[PDB]
Amino acid sequence: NSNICEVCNKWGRLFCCDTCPRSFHEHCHIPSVEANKNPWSCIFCRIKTIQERCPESQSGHQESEVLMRQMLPEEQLKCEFLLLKVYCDSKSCFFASEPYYNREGSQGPQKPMWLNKVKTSLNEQMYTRVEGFVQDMRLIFHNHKEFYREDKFTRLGIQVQDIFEKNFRNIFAIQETS
Numbered sequence: 769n770s771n772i773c774e775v776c777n778k779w780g781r782l783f784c785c786d787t788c789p790r791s792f793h794e795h796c797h798i799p800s801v802e803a804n805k806n807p808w809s810c811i812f813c814r815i816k817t818i819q820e821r822c823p824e825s826q827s828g829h830q831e832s833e834v835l836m837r838q839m840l841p842e843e844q845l846k847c848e849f850l851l852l853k854v855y856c857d858s859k860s861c862f863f864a865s866e867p868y869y870n871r872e873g874s875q876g877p878q879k880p881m882w883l884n885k886v887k888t889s890l891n892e893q894m895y896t897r898v899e900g901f902v903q904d905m906r907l908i909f910h911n912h913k914e915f916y917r918e919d920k921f922t923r924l925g926i927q928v929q930d931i932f933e934k935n936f937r938n939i940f941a942i943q944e945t946s
């Protein structure tokens with residue numbers, strides 16, 4: 769196994785996957801690492817199994833169809849993995865916890881959003897379709913862009929949204945376009 773957390777790349781109290789060499793802190797893994805279960809497989813392994821059980825799941829999809837899907841177990845897992853993939857980038861730190869807004873010449877967004885709130889929302893099964901989760905994710909970056917305006921800090925939101933969007937297209941097998 770690895771000696772660092774796959775998500776935050778630090779050492780500490782880790783839990784090791786039984787079917788791959790990754791390891792995780794308890795609350796870096798999503799869902800949080802399960803109390804018992806021996807063996808234990810991590811989210812990367814679970815996602816791989818879904819693909820291997822239904823190879824045609826990797827043929828192209830239209831985003832519109834994906835968004836309308838109900839959050840049944842397999843879609844729930846895929847959104848948890850996509851959330852995880854964002855927390856894997858160190859720039860997610862800017863978007864994790866509840867933000868506040870007091871900048872000369874800007875007003876705060878009408879609907880604040882942050883990653884830990886989405887995490888909690890997924891945990892408490894508050895989204896009924898993929899669209900719900902995707903909307904909150906994109907809201908995070910959109911709020912950031914609107915608030916920071918011409919400050920170069922806006923770029924952080926562009927960069928982390930690019931991470932989200934590449935992973936979204938991969939995990940949900942969105943049809944490749946030019």
Ligand SMILES: [Zn+2]
Binds near residue numbers: 773796
């Ligand atoms: Zn970690």
Ligand SMILES: [Zn+2]
Binds near residue numbers: 787789811
């Ligand atoms: Zn694994």
Ligand SMILES: [Zn+2]
Binds near residue numbers: 821822823
């Ligand atoms: Zn099949």
